[PDB]
Structure 1
């Protein structure tokens, strides 16, 4: 990109790359329900190992698994996401076989669903924000003291 003369910040590329290597291959499942060579998410095996250490069991050894953006997105937790992308048949088959539940965490599955997108103003952080004015505020402020007397 810099050779071509196009300047862009490293952040974006870094995000994509982190999404690329986000997967893991299991070696010696230990005391978990996992199997050797089973592929899953970084944070998942991390958490599982935390709990296993807390439970006084043997954690799961693993190896970093980096895949192309296509297969990376294809292996994602949201089946609607992978379905909408491409290779619809394979996804749907594996999906329904395992009976996986999409929790609708990502934005585009919600886009399919026609539900308010988890990002932006629809972010669970800012969307519950309430707005009042002084007079109404004082009215409902009396509303609390008249409840205990009734």
Structure 2
């Protein structure tokens, strides 16, 4: 981009690279039911590892993994977004067998169902804000 004169902040590229490095590969199952060589999200194994330490068990040993944007997108936890992207037959056949439950976390899943996307005015941070004047509030405070 620089060689072409395009100016782009490094944040946008680092957001995508963060998604590429989102997964890890298990090398030692430890005191868990995970399989050696199984690929899962880095957040899950770290959360599982800190959990295993809590009850005094051998933590899961993992290895950082890098995959492309297509592979990272297709191996997402939500089957609705993955099915709408590509390999619809392959995504749906695995999700149906695994009985995968889509929690509707991202934007594509909510768009498919026509729901309010969890971003912007639809985010839980601002969605529940209330507005009231100093007279409709003062009267309520009395009660």
Normalising by structure 2, we get a TM-score of: 0.98
In the TM superposition, what is the alpha-carbon distance from 1:71 to its structure 2 partner? Answer: 0.8
CA deviations 1:119-139 (Å, max 9, x no partner) are: 111000111011110110011
Query: Which 4+ runs in 1 deviate beyond 6 A?
Result: none
Distance in 2 between the 1:109 and 1:93 partners? Answer: 18
In the TM superposition, what is the alpha-carbon distance from 1:55 to its structure 2 partner? Answer: 1.2
SS of structure 1 residue aligned to 2:64: strand
In the TM superposition, what is the alpha-carbon distance from 1:141 to its structure 2 partner? Answer: 1.0
Distance in 2 between the 1:2 and 1:98 partners? Answer: 45
CA deviations 1:16-41 (Å, max 9, x no partner) are: 00100111110111001111111100
In the TM superposition, what is the alpha-carbon distance from 1:14 to its structure 2 partner? Answer: 0.3
Distance in 1 between the 2:44 and 2:28 partners? Answer: 16
SS of structure 2 residue aligned to 1:27: strand
Partner of 1:96: 96
Distance in 2 between the 1:71 and 1:16 partners? Answer: 13
Normalising by structure 1, we get a TM-score of: 0.93
The alignment of Structure 1 onto Structure 2 pairs a total of residues equal to 143
Partner of 2:22: 22
Matched, 1:50 2:40: no
